Design a protein around this ligand. Structure first.
Ligand SMILES: CC(C)CN1CCc2cc(O)ccc2[C@H]1c1ccc(/C=C/C(=O)O)cc1
Ligand SMILES: CC(C)CN1CCc2cc(O)ccc2[C@H]1c1ccc(/C=C/C(=O)O)cc1
Lengths: 228, 228
């Protein structure tokens, strides 16, 4: 994992990409939103576990640490996936190819339109930056490794060190992608910063989303069971 | 602001630094924690407004946008300040020079020890990275400009553009500080990323903190009044 080249890292992440799932509803029947979104999120989680195990360095960690990282990051990962899927659909959120929802549709649940608006704005930011697929997969892997790394013994110190080393490799990779695309050294650092700063907003969105869900979520046990 | 050199940006930010305030309690009297922390935060906010107005580019924005940015960022700014103050005090949070609290003291309020632990871990991360004062002031300014920029008309488009341009200048500045300190180009990008990724955790901490406070906060009107 730490011996991978930038090109190899990118290829590994692109290969690890999960599929785009569909919403489960009878399309011949008349058009609950939260039920549809929950069932979709449930099914995506399984594929996210598989994806996570294919992110270089991730399976080198202890099971306990893998669970902690996924516990911290899962909603951020679903959200960045959603925002990426929605990028070329101004004003809409592509939850699934058969479930493309606008802001007005979000108003059907109390507190939801606020979250829809933040996701739509992130998609807008992605569009304005012209985010590339190779950059997106790097960012999603960064979320997985970074979100829980500040909230964790000699083994723990080794785990955190490894995580930072893998994150450094992904940073190198992002820069390499920007250098290959022809950006100047200045533009490279600037774009790196712009991309990483969006991750703070994705964290914010996830926290707001978790508040919504807790006001009504995969347990440590379910995640542990799925990862073990 | 956009014509400032890296050295000028750093100097401007160092000059803008607010003072370290003291907790208001009778030190001759026997040792409420939340009351002490709230009163401290109240007084710090006033100085934060002054500081914000001295961050290059900030007063170029509309009053409304200044308020929005501060509304989004104020707790993150208090927290990064706290973590910086605490950096050379392992296991303790230096809320003020006369109010140095350990994790055990946080247990006196339900839900607080969790927040103390996250802040202490961030201080630990700062210590391990050997964060420099010049880097800290850059990061605090980045929080101010970035935290609310995704949640905002032709004027709004101009405002967001300006904010991104100022953020790009601060990125250039951070890199310049790392280049002057003798880091390689690789190390520069890596450290930039490490620093910006901590900001995601600071956002997380602020969200957790706001949840605590809302379960019991400066209004738009107070912030507007103070900024106007
Ligand atoms: C209020 C948010 C949590 C709604 N999110 C937005 C992000 C997102 C992305 C997806 O790609 C699929 C669904 C969603 C939904 C969502 C809705 C419900 C749940 C609930 C999960 C559970 O209760 O286990 C999770 C996410
Ligand atoms: C639970 C957290 C919000 C406690 N924080 C931690 C960060 C911090 C940094 C400071 O430098 C000073 C105080 C604090 C406290 C804190 C406590 C109360 C309030 C309340 C403010 C209000 O009610 O206006 C804000 C922050």
């Amino acid at each position: 994992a730490l011996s991978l080249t930038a090109d190899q890292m990118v290829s590994a992440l692109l290969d690890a990409e999960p599929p785009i799932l569909y919403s489960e509803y009878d399309p011949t029947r008349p058009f609950s939103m939260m039920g549809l979104l929950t069932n979709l999120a449930d099914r995506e989680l399984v594929h996210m576990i598989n994806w996570a195990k294919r992110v270089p360095g991730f399976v080198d960690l202890t099971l306990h640490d893998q669970v902690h990282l996924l516990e911290s990051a899962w909603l951020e990962i679903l959200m960045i996936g959603l925002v990426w899927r929605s990028m070329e659909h101004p004003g809409k959120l592509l939850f699934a190819p058969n479930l493309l929802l606008d802001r007005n549709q979000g108003k059907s649940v109390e507190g939801m339109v606020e979250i829809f608006d933040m996701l739509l704005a992130t998609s807008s930011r992605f569009r304005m930056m012209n985010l590339q697929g190779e950059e997106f997969v790097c960012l999603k892997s960064i979320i997985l490794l970074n979100s829980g790394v500040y909230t964790f013994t000699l083994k723990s110190l080794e785990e955190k060190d490894h995580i930072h080393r893998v994150l450094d490799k992904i940073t190198d990779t992002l820069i390499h992608l920007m250098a290959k695309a022809g950006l100047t050294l200045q533009q490279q650092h600037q774009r790196l910063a712009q991309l990483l700063l969006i991750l703070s907003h994705i964290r914010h969105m996830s926290n707001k989303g978790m508040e919504h869900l807790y006001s009504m979520v995969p347990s440590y046990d379910l995640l542990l069971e799925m990862l073990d």
